[PDB]
Design a protein around this ligand. Structure first.
Ligand SMILES: *[C@@H]1O[C@H](CO)[C@@H](O[C@@H]2O[C@H](CO)[C@@H](O[C@@H]3O[C@H](CO)[C@@H](O)[C@H](O)[C@@H]3O)[C@H](O)[C@H]2NC(C)=O)[C@H](O)[C@H]1NC(C)=O
Ligand SMILES: *[C@@H]1O[C@H](CO)[C@@H](O[C@@H]2O[C@H](CO)[C@@H](O[C@@H]3O[C@H](CO)[C@@H](O)[C@H](O)[C@@H]3O)[C@H](O)[C@H]2NC(C)=O)[C@H](O)[C@H]1NC(C)=O
Ligand SMILES: *[C@@H]1O[C@H](CO)[C@@H](O[C@@H]2O[C@H](CO)[C@@H](O)[C@H](O)[C@H]2NC(C)=O)[C@H](O)[C@H]1NC(C)=O
Ligand SMILES: *[C@@H]1O[C@H](CO)[C@@H](O[C@@H]2O[C@H](CO)[C@@H](O)[C@H](O)[C@H]2NC(C)=O)[C@H](O)[C@H]1NC(C)=O
Ligand SMILES: *[C@@H]1O[C@H](CO)[C@@H](O)[C@H](O)[C@H]1NC(C)=O
Ligand SMILES: *[C@@H]1O[C@H](CO)[C@@H](O)[C@H](O)[C@H]1NC(C)=O
Ligand SMILES: *[C@@H]1O[C@H](CO)[C@@H](O)[C@H](O)[C@H]1NC(C)=O
Ligand SMILES: *[C@@H]1O[C@H](CO)[C@@H](O)[C@H](O)[C@H]1NC(C)=O
Ligand SMILES: *[C@@H]1O[C@H](CO)[C@@H](O)[C@H](O)[C@H]1NC(C)=O
Ligand SMILES: *[C@@H]1O[C@H](CO)[C@@H](O)[C@H](O)[C@H]1NC(C)=O
Lengths: 418, 136, 417
């Protein structure tokens, strides 16, 4: 049950093991496999990553891999990823973003397809297309176009993309994290405006906070996080709804995540603006999409520029890294996450089990310096014990091909064992 | 590690015609310190853009160039660490790779009035451009 | 318009074999089989299958796709320049492929299935169909065909791209296809009109209805047709599947569409009772109506109850694929590498012929040579008509079996040796 280390300690034994047989190995050294995504649910997972030529940008990719698989016991006393099906996205050369959801022991991929890589800066969603690609271990993949024409929205959104590290299945409804674009300032910022930081001499805090939500490449557009709820009758009569995130503690649009864990629904939002601390919380209401935001004072992320690690004050900033979290104990408010132990550079990944107020324990992945652009983590019960699987967007071989890495580890049964 | 580059009009490394050229190898660190409050109180405010060679010659930036780092605070020693790895925590990826060129400039007027002036500025007046040909 | 157009002996085709295009496998167990070649606008697309200790089409672990160009080497003859060579990403599941060279690039239309017998017990919704396309510089890319948005003129239950080549017309691709349908929706005035001995078992109407059945599924019928694929630069595909005319129906078989001499030529291999050349230029596209020739001299060998030159309707299956290529539209002249044997697949001969008479011919090899099918494409080179044919040869005994490419010229003058 809930018998594991719940105290501050050193030298944890995560029994860390790398998994190499899941992610394919590309023969071309010039191809960069980037932006991995992984979502685990009910013993099955969905893995996604992008392949590009001499460039690791997501939409700048000629192939997008979609893998479905299962968690299997090999008598090893630890979970193994068993790859069942592997297909390439039929519209890979036009993929702007994708989000994985493992529903009913099957894989579902929600992607945004466009002819224009800059569609989010100069276009609208009527000019683009959105698809659901779904398959499992036996059935051939089928791709259905999402009828955004028949979509209902809670605000005057002009654009949107599925952006995040994973989604959620609730009954007949899919709930996918999404980033929307709107061209008017309809927002309030009590949280940002309440900070007592030095006021920069050009503008005031209300202006600073309004403008910090703007797109950095279209001074006229604003990026707001939200969710998309898609209900349907066995791929029939789609009903699509687009709801924005709560205006309490707004942060610039960024890839998020929804996860089914411990009887709860956990929302995560990558911190790509001035508030560099963990934005995460369990879902209270669905309209408006209100996650109960944490007061985490120990988990941050690196970034260059005016908002490095542990930066708090409001400032017109853009940049950051995606680092999923996974809850371990609801009563003790414990979570685990692979974060980057650096102030400005994206390197030195560390498995970190933490409080909202204190870091409980941590361990470096590699003894040598390791480049890591993003991490995702999912935890689950296996043989009545808590195990976790993380995917790291690594670049250990600089100059050669890039390929993410998968690690499996266990929450320590006892504290301080080495 | 490399010698950090203080970004101020009072730095000799900015050659009057060639800017500041650096030949960093992959895996090198490089700080770009924007100056503290100088002794003579000449407040220095800039806004740096990661740019392309053509518009680095023309010294003009459109909306697409991303504000790499801005020298907002005069008192706080604002800085900018760079490791020439491929993956970077910046918006728009910014892959470094090898045997490429990477140009960093500012189009701003010395003070905060022209902080976001993108037309001309220091790129041509003082030629404070950082050019980094990795390799060789 | 200046070449031999009369009956003559001892023609000088200036025949030369090409060996550097098709790879040579070091492994003796590999069977290189079912070659396909399509030439268009000075570029070609070659395809063949590789299998282990078996030369069966779906029994193949590798499928080679080659793109190339016709180049003058100052040799006073065309040379094949191999540009790109790739293996199909789904080779172990390929049931059939058809090549099309469009706009100086290669396009391969393939049918992929888990079941090598999918045509006997499955349907096309259970399978997948792809277009793999590439040229000399771009990496090959494979796109899935959206058969969900396809419109059909009849109740077809299955289909495979089956043939030696397709055709590019503007923005539309026209690929030969063989369809499967489980109800007899056909008429047979042509077969029923034959004045042959009545078989004691069945009547001529039954003989002709049943001869269209699959020989491995008494409940299914195989009907030839075409597939028209229009698109907006690989976007918003519009796919249409039209069946061949019911005039002079013959059992489903690999066909061909070729752009030659300002016309579009359709060929159908004779795998049923009508053992004579099935070919003709396309009049209408819906229904797919080729103006069938009345050829009395070109046939093909086969074992069993329908050998070479058999005419009378009979429930027969078997035959060889032998492309033709037109040489002169006004003179109704054609060239083809046919098999000079009554029942065995051997002795290939380059044959220039009328609809009613054989003009001249030449054996490819002095020794006996095994050849299961031939394909031929002709074109203008240096203001002269030249042709290139590919034969799935077995020159060594057994072992490493590999096709061969030959180039030859239509004789300028008659009877020169
Ligand atoms: C997780 O967060 C909670 C707060 O939400 C932390 O609460 C309390 O922290 C103190 C200081 O570490 C713990 O120890 C104290 O030690 C002295 C030693 O004599 C003792 O007299 C105090 O009464 C207290 O026990 C305290 O145990 C802990 N609260 C509870 C209920 O145990 C907590 O420390 C954070 N997690 C960890 C692992 O520290
Ligand atoms: C920055 O983002 C805004 C928000 O979308 C962009 O606004 C839109 O910009 C387009 C052209 O850039 C405007 O043009 C419109 O085109 C149609 C088609 O001819 C015409 O019917 C309209 O009357 C108008 O001319 C459009 O009005 C404008 N606003 C909206 C709501 O669409 C802006 O273009 C972006 N700027 C950059 C530099 O990316
Ligand atoms: C740098 O650019 C700023 C741009 O605002 C200049 O400030 C303006 O200068 C013009 C002169 O052309 C004045 O008419 C304006 O009143 C000034 N302010 C504004 C808000 O436009 C500044 O003079 C330039 N030079 C410096 C700072 O040395
Ligand atoms: C021969 O073809 C017929 C016609 O399709 C097959 O009969 C069908 O088989 C499928 C799959 O077993 C069933 O779902 C259909 O209900 C059958 N009837 C029809 C009208 O389609 C028959 O199975 C084939 N013979 C084989 C496979 O040996
Ligand atoms: C789409 O919208 C129309 C009107 O807004 C509504 O009647 C219909 O139920 C919706 N759904 C579908 C599938 O048409
Ligand atoms: C997934 O399972 C739930 C079980 O309650 C069901 O309601 C839902 O319709 C399923 N999703 C499908 C069939 O797409
Ligand atoms: C900022 O304001 C809050 C609420 O008014 C207050 O609790 C906090 O102490 C203030 N910060 C400082 C440094 O005083
Ligand atoms: C938010 O977090 C800070 C961190 O210590 C804490 O002091 C504050 O009380 C928290 N707010 C609430 C409402 O608990
Ligand atoms: C070709 O056929 C026509 C009639 O179909 C015949 O008159 C002509 O002689 C034939 N060609 C030759 C070379 O005999
Ligand atoms: C090929 O050439 C034809 C010429 O009419 C043109 O219509 C078509 O767009 C070209 N491209 C493709 C992919 O067919």
């Amino acid at each position: 049950g809930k018998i594991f280390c719940k105290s501050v300690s050193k030298d944890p034994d995560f029994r860390l093991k790398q998994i190499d047989y899941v992610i394919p190995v590309q023969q071309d050294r010039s191809i960069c496999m980037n932006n991995p995504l992984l979502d685990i649910s009910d013993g099955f997972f969905t893995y996604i990553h992008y392949e590009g030529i001499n460039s690791c940008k997501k939409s700048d990719s000629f192939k997008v891999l979609l893998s479905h698989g299962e968690i299997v016991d090999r008598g090893d006393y630890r979970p193994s990823l068993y790859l069942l099906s592997s297909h390439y996205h039929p519209y890979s050369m036009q993929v702007i973003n994708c989000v994985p959801v493992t529903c009913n022991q099957s894989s579902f991929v929600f992607c945004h397809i466009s002819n224009n890589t800059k569609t989010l800066d100069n276009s609208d969603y009527s000019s683009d297309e959105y698809y659901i690609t779904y398959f499992n271990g036996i059935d051939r993949p089928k791709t259905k176009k999402i009828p955004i024409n028949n979509m209902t929205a809670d605000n005057r959104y002009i654009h949107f993309t599925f952006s995040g590290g994973g989604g959620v299945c609730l009954g007949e409804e899919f709930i996918i994290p999404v980033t929307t674009v709107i061209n008017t300032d309809v927002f309030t910022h009590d949280y940002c405006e309440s900070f007592n930081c030095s006021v920069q001499t050009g503008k005031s805090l209300k202006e600073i906070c309004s403008e910090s939500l703007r797109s950095p490449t279209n001074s006229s557009r604003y990026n707001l996080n939200g969710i998309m709820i898609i209900s349907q009758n066995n791929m029939t009569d789609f009903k699509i709804q687009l709801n924005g995130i709560t205006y309490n503690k707004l942060s610039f649009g960024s890839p998020g995540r929804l996860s089914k864990t411990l009887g709860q629904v956990l929302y995560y939002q990558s911190s790509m603006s001035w508030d560099t601390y963990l934005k995460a919380g369990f879902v209270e209401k669905w309209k408006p999409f209100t996650p109960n935001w944490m007061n985490n004072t120990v988990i941050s992320r690196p970034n260059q520029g005016n908002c490095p690690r542990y930066h708090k004050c409001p400032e017109i900033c853009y940049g950051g890294t995606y680092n999923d979290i996974a809850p371990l104990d609801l009563g003790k408010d414990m979570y685990v996450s692979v974060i980057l132990d650096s102030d400005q550079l994206a390197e030195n990944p560390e498995i970190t089990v933490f409080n909202s107020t204190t870091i409980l324990y941590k361990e470096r992945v590699s003894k040598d310096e390791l480049n890591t652009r993003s991490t995702t983590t999912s935890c689950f019960l296996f043989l009545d014990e808590p195990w976790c699987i993380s995917v790291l967007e690594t670049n250990r071989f600089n100059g050669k091909s890039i390929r993410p890495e998968i690690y499996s580890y266990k929450i320590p049964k006892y504290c301080g064992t080495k | 590690n490399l010698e950090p580059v203080s970004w101020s009009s009072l730095n000799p490394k900015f050659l009057s015609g060639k800017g500041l050229v650096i030949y960093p190898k992959i895996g090198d660190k490089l700080d770009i310190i924007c100056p503290r409050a100088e002794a003579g109180r000449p407040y220095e405010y800039y806004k740096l853009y990661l740019v392309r060679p053509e518009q680095a010659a023309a010294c003009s930036t459109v909306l697409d160039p991303n504000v790499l780092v801005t020298c907002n605070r005069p008192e706080q020693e604002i800085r900018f660490t760079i490791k020439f790895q491929e993956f970077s925590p910046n918006y728009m990826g910014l892959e470094f790779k090898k045997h490429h060129d990477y140009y960093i400039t500012s189009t701003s007027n010395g003070s905060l009035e022209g902080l976001e002036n993108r037309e001309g500025g220091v790129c041509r007046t003082r030629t404070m451009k950082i050019i980094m040909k990795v390799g060789q």
